[PDB]
Amino acid sequence: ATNLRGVMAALLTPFDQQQALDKASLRRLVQFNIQQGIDGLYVGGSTGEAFVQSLSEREQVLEIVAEEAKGKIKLIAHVGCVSTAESQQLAASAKRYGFDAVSAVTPFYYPFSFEEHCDHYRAIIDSADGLPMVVYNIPALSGVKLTLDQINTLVTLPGVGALKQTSGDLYQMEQIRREHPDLVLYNGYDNIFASGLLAGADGGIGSTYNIMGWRYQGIVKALKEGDIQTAQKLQTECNKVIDLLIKTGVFRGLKTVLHYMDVVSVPLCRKPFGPVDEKYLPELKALAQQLMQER
Amino acid sequence: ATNLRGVMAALLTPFDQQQALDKASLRRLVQFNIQQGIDGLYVGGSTGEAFVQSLSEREQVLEIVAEEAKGKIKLIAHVGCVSTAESQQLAASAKRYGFDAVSAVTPFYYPFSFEEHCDHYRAIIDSADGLPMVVYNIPALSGVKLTLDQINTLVTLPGVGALKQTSGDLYQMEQIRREHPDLVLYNGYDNIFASGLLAGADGGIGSTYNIMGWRYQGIVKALKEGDIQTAQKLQTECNKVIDLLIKTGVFRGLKTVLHYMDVVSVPLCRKPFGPVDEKYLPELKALAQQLMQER
Amino acid sequence: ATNLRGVMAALLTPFDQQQALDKASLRRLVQFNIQQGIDGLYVGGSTGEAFVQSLSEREQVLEIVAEEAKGKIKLIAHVGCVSTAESQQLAASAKRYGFDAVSAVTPFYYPFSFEEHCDHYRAIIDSADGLPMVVYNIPALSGVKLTLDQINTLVTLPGVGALKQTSGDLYQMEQIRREHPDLVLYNGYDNIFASGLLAGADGGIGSTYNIMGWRYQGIVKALKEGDIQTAQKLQTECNKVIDLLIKTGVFRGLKTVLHYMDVVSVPLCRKPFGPVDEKYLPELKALAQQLMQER
Amino acid sequence: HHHHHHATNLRGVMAALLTPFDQQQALDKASLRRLVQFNIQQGIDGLYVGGSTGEAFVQSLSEREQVLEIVAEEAKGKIKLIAHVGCVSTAESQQLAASAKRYGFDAVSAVTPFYYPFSFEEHCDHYRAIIDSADGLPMVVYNIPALSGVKLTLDQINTLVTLPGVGALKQTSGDLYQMEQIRREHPDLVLYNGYDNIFASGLLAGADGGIGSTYNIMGWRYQGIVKALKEGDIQTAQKLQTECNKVIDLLIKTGVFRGLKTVLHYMDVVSVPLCRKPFGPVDEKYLPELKALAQQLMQERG
């Protein structure tokens, strides 16, 4: 688990104008992240548009990422589905491709009990056969509202080695750090990263790292040097970008920046996501140039 | 839409001890519903555990139900998935198997714009090729919170013949009816059926109809005849049953009652749903006996 | 408390352009409700703008209404404040003025424990010295979310004789009735009144009854006779009005209609409520005329 | 924005003053004077009087004025004084605003009016009417979605805090993206962090101070957090926040206001540690921990 500490980009999954997987742009996105000095990749997550892909499509992506990056950076495979059995098939494939860790969102849509959530995690942990599990918590999207004691139980299940904390409650962040001094604890909301680190997170997983992951590692560095102004200046610049991405749609906006940075051929998300509003293309192109000249 | 008015049971998907589709019990459940005098079946919806099934499993159930019941009662295929493309495949298949209509839940998990929801429905309607669309609204589960104006636009899309209203807001039920005098409008919450018809619904789609559909037909008849005491008494008996099912877990409780009714071989839902707590089996066995005495 | 069953108008408190109480319009509005055939008045509730008045103002209104109506119709005094001691002073004043019952909204703003709520009601009941209590439940405004079990404990407290159920959940409406066969159970949402009565309510307390209370009485009649069609027509007509009142602002729209019916001199609510938008006045004026013609 | 510049002197760490009561639940005046002096000696920059913490919403206007008057007698000119004058009623809030001016307060404040749904424009007029009655005292807009039920957008918050006469925001919200957004839009705005359990994180996000209820019993820790961060000493800032949160953990279990009043009782400041009904008493079993906490706090602050 300890080697899982770090700044991990939640990888986007490129598609073509036919909505098919674009494998050439995936390979390029993987190499691009590595060149920015990212610690690892979180593959097939919410950011990866997991839940509009087939299991087969998810596996193909996991396989290719592993081909490109195994041994060079850490690789966490998000294998979560609503189904335990579907989640187990993806866990076993992650193991076969040599991933360092697996991950699963709290199963969603149907109300499940906390005990059913634990057994779900237990099954996936077994099928991962030695890979540590990152319990993925995102109430805003999943509608699963765990109490702190429930969170505490999840993180001490045999084989759990990390929590992806996609929550803006930095009180809870602090309570988790205080209860589990050694837990790998990822900040999930990009736009509060600096504050999340201050509250007790030791790293993060985020969609925006795909295009400015060096800024987030600047924040970890700046904070560790004790340089608050630089930490704040960097968070502020991240949030200027995040404002625009929320206006445009986050995933399709990030893909569009990556298109102008010559990485992703076609910046589409799968339907029912629609295309970026074309009036936002200048801002997005300019941001691309800004970021390209910056690093 | 006209001939789509009525009481339609939200079909459960039966599974064998290995959590595979139990074909024999499925066919048994279809006929058993028909023998209760239901107007139709709503196949592959939430109640049918669609969201823990693959597209081919969902197709297999649709085909078998068409075999058992095409031309004897009305058949509606819930083909909704998060992905538009996935929902399109299921729609094309429902057409091939000879279904009367298609239906789709508002795509969930990722937040989609309302126009995005509109295109999603347009695309599924094209792929259904003549089959009317039943728009399926369930804020509680889907997390999508439509305004009345947005509901009005959706239900007037070319090819929409109906709205499944799984909401407890009976002001909105009446408003919808007032705006659309001829819309087929299905009450979705079993425990307000009587009240929902009074507010403007002209039928229902429900999970608990699988074991007591004749009660819901009895509520329709009684209200039709100005027979209010009888309506209230039937709704009360339905709610005594619904109290218990909410305690046991609704899908698995229903399947367990059907197991004591000699319809379902193994009353399990798919993981992560767990089993029924052993302490409730006496109560559910009692219930089975009572409903068999009845009729 | 069988004698408290019925359709009670939630009395508006008239004000002048200086924002002081208008006692001449208050007296006129009381007689107007009595002439309309109403069963009682609910005085100084939410509709009565209690929470922008002092205790002395609230007492001045309770006194005037008792002078005007005691012995002619039933009188319920809403005495609730956030403070228990303040609510007791009002409960004592209501007893002195010869009210038939007291009522208190679940105390708000500060989160209080359920037991803290129960003691609150006990103390008010004591100060009321023999006047039955109407527990006033309105989650949407109060922010207090009681479970069914908690509701059951409140309604069986010694000295409670009724429940004002301002909730859209008609399943809970049925469950409360089923548990408490003799409880006086008031429907709080005017726009689901017919459906509320069907689910188990035996009456109502409502703001819109001030201008068309005879319609709600017609709904009770129609449903006692099994005339569902008239009940629906009346509820639909109530809801056309409620749609407009929601656009104009409800209390002030009601007060404006009353101004055109020559009952209220000045149709203002207290600041921070603003005035009705003048573009609505032709509609409010036509409504007044329509309702005056109907009788 | 000129009203923001003029309120620059309001930046700081301000305790949300509790209101002590006697055995009959009337104002305990001796204890209030003690509590006020006790806050001053901790090195607190100021007091926020008659807010949620002060149990305003179970007091009459006359009781709120009495508290305002007494606190001014005790602290005027020595530390900054902000008067929470907010009621649901605009006119009630205006009376309290005028009184606060008469007693020499440095600023007024009003929670967004609650219970009834008001439009945004109706909110703006409410603040404007109260600003008029404050007669030159700057306004601190007090935002607390959790308790108020009022859910303002960022654009609406931007408009509120730039109304003429406004010079500060009390932001009792745990959304630190919005904290940063407010700071970036309003470089000179006084911006108080409202949730004690995230103070250090709120400051990092853009707050330039805080208003809180736990400052009554450990305000020097929050000053310690401000100093640690100014110097770039992250370890000291984190250790102080951690200790504040161990204390907040306990108070959430006991009840926050009554738990604070009890600690202060064991610190010899408050005579009777009750809140007003329908608040109930602290559970007997928590008294050992609360005395223990009082002892630890008097130790570390010698």
Ligand SMILES: CCCN(CCC)C(=O)[C@H](O)[C@H](O)CO
């Ligand atoms: C409501 C905030 C939604 N966000 C934050 C924008 C960066 C997201 O869904 C992000 O993708 C999340 O923080 C993971 O990167």
Ligand SMILES: CCCN(CCC)C(=O)[C@H](O)[C@H](O)CO
């Ligand atoms: C919470 C009430 C249970 N439900 C939902 C089924 C999980 C119902 O009563 C509805 O009738 C359901 O949507 C389908 O019948």
Ligand SMILES: CCCN(CCC)C(=O)[C@H](O)[C@H](O)CO
């Ligand atoms: C949100 C509006 C619903 N209503 C009914 C309007 C007639 C109310 O909130 C009423 O003020 C309430 O039901 C009291 O009659």
Ligand SMILES: CCCN(CCC)C(=O)[C@H](O)[C@H](O)CO
């Ligand atoms: C989730 C923390 C709740 N808190 C923090 C102090 C215990 C509060 O509600 C406070 O009363 C608020 O921050 C004002 O100090």
